[PDB]
Structure formats: C-alpha cells, structure tokens
C-alpha cells in the first residue's frame, strides 16, 4: 500500500550548530514528506524539517515547509514558538510522542532549488532552533520559524539524514527529488564539513519499489509507481562540491537614523539578495572616531527585528555603530551620524 521510504545519509556528518542542504522536487505524489534535515533520534531535542506535498499532485495542491522538535525528556517547561513567518502556523503534536511543529504554506516549484538552513544557538539558558529557506531561483532568503527549547547545550548532535516518506499509503503514486550542497558547521571548530559523499538506501531491504543515483550536479531518488532499484539495497555517490561552502554576503541599507523629542529611531533593510539577519547591536558614541566607551548600547536585537525606537537622553552630536551579523556569523558594521530631526 505505501511507497517504501528512501534515506540519503552523509558519510561524514558531525555535531553541528548549522546544517544546510539544497532540494529540488521532480515528482510530487500527495502525502509525501521530504525531511531534508533530521537530528537527535531518540534523544534530547530530536527534530526534523523539510517539505511536504500535503494534497494534490502539483503546485495547485497544498505545498508546505515542515519543522518539528520533540518535547524535552526531563524539563516540564514548554517549547515556545518564538517566531512564525506570515504563512507559518505553530501547533503541538501528539500520538506516541509530543512536541511542537511549525507548518508553513510555501509555493515551491518542480525543478527549482530550495536551500533549507537550520541553526541552533544558546540564548538565556535555552537552546533556539531556527529554520531559514532560500528560494534559489528568486535569490531570496526567508526566516520561517524559531523554536525556543527549554534545555541548554543541545544542538544537531547526531543522526544527519534526509528521508522521502509516504505517510498515508499511495505507493501507486511516484515521488522523486534531487539534493546537493549538503554542509554542516562543526561545534568543535566552527569550520564546515562537506557532505560530498552520501548513501542512498531504501528503508526496507526486501522492497525494491524505489531507485536512486547521481549526476555530476545532484543525487536523485524516487519511490512508488513503476520505480525499481538499479542500485540493489543502496549505493554511495560523491558530488564534486567545494570542501568550504559558497556563502553569500550580508548587505543592508540604513533607512533612518534620527533623534527627536528624546526618541532614537534607527531602521535598516537587508538587500533582497542578502544573507539573512541573525542578530544586531548598536553602540552610540559622543565622538566621530568612536574612541572610549559608548554613552549608550542597544543589545540583543533579534533576527526578526529591522529597527529600534528607544527613549534616551543624548548630547548634540552622536554617532551610531550599527553591528549586524547574519546566520553564518558574518558581521557588517556601519557608522552613521544620528540626525537631530526626522
């Protein structure tokens, strides 16, 4: 009744705080989950993320992103949905296990590339898990969702794998996708591990209703319909990707920097093609060279905040050091004179 699962597994993944892979759908049977990221199976902060064809066979069906983290093993504190995008909905799941999921309506398209990048980080004694998606054709990043997990010092510790799964039982319907550009950032040294070599493996060694292979460009895999394995129970394949990933640049324009009636307003906009914002800080100096100590500091500007409005007492001539950093820890600093009129 069900298409067999297919797993694509890096040979060399390690404990990571950033995990990234590129995915392209080819055939999209309904009730298919491409979980392109998986971590900590059976463990603290177990989770996954990817793409679902929830209904229909094509773009006119319900196409989504998915993100889930299982409830803490010991802590009684709830996982919080800290941030959901305009098309994202956070809900608690149940059945044999419980936790938090974010489902995001997202009009992804056949034969287009989608880069799903997850980051885990420590903030206020908790671990945050964030989901970002680059639409490669549009050259546009979007922040999808951030979960606040009430246990410190958890990360994408083990179990990196992708799966394609039929969750309803329509093994007659073929599902096929491609992946490339798998990378993790190591907890050990903050350097990148390249998943250049991956195994493609059917879930059931006795079920051959799936197939896989690689071009010089991508790994591909399918299951269901007339799929029949050309690679036995599984096979390993190498892509010629660079050992360090090609990371774009953080690029933004300051839109306002003015002080009026004891209120400081500073706003910015990342360029359409920029890497996405991870955090911000603004130091305010009483001198152009920004020597000595700032007279004031605005800390803990979040990934989802593109400005500040603060009641503050300043002298005549103030200068703002705007320090933004992207999800890849690239920092871009601008120095702007604060204007004393809106």
């Amino acid at each position: 009744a069900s298409a067999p699962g297919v797993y694509v597994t890096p040979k060399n993944s390690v404990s990571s705080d950033i995990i990234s892979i590129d995915w392209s759908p080819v055939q999209t049977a309904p009730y298919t989950y491409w979980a392109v990221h998986n971590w900590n199976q059976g463990g603290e902060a177990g989770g996954y993320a990817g793409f679902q064809q929830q209904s229909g066979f094509d773009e006119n069906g319900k196409r989504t992103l998915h993100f889930a983290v299982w409830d803490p093993i010991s802590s009684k504190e709830a996982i919080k949905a800290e941030y959901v995008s305009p098309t994202s909905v956070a809900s608690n799941f149940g059945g044999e296990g419980t936790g938090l999921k974010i489902q995001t309506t997202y009009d992804w398209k056949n034969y287009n590339w989608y880069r799903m990048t997850m980051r885990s980080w420590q903030e206020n004694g908790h671990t945050k898990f964030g989901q970002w998606l680059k639409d490669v054709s549009k050259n546009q990043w979007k922040l999808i969702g951030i979960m606040d997990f009430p246990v410190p010092n958890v990360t994408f510790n083990y179990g990196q794998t992708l799966f394609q799964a039929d969750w309803l039982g329509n093994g007659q319907d073929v599902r096929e996708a491609r992946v490339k550009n798998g990378y993790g950032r190591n907890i050990s040294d903050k350097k990148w591990t390249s998943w250049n070599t991956q195994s493609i493996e059917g879930q059931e060694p006795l079920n051959n209703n799936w197939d896989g292979g690689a071009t010089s460009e991508y790994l591909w895999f399918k299951a269901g319909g007339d799929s029949r394995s050309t690679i036995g129970t599984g096979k390993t394949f190498t892509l010629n990707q660079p050992s360090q990933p090609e990371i774009g640049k953080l690029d933004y324009d300051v839109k306002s920097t003015y002080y009026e009636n004891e209120k400081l307003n500073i706003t910015w906009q990342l360029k359409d093609s920029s890497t996405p914002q991870f955090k911000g800080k603004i130091e305010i100096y009483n001198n152009e060279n920004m020597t000595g100590q700032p007279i004031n500091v605005i800390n803990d500007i979040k990934s989802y905040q593109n400005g500040i409005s603060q009641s503050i007492s300043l002298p005549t001539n103030t200068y703002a050091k705007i320090v933004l950093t992207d999800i890849f820890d690239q920092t871009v600093e601008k120095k702007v004179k604060i204007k004393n009129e809106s």
Binding site: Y7, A35, N38, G42, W167
Partner: peptide
Amino acid sequence: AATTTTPAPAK
C-alpha cells in the same frame, strides 16, 4: 490522525 515518524537511533 496523520503520523510522520522517524528512524530509530542505532542500538
């Protein structure tokens, strides 16, 4: 009642 389970850890 849809479920989307995951692989078990290695023993």
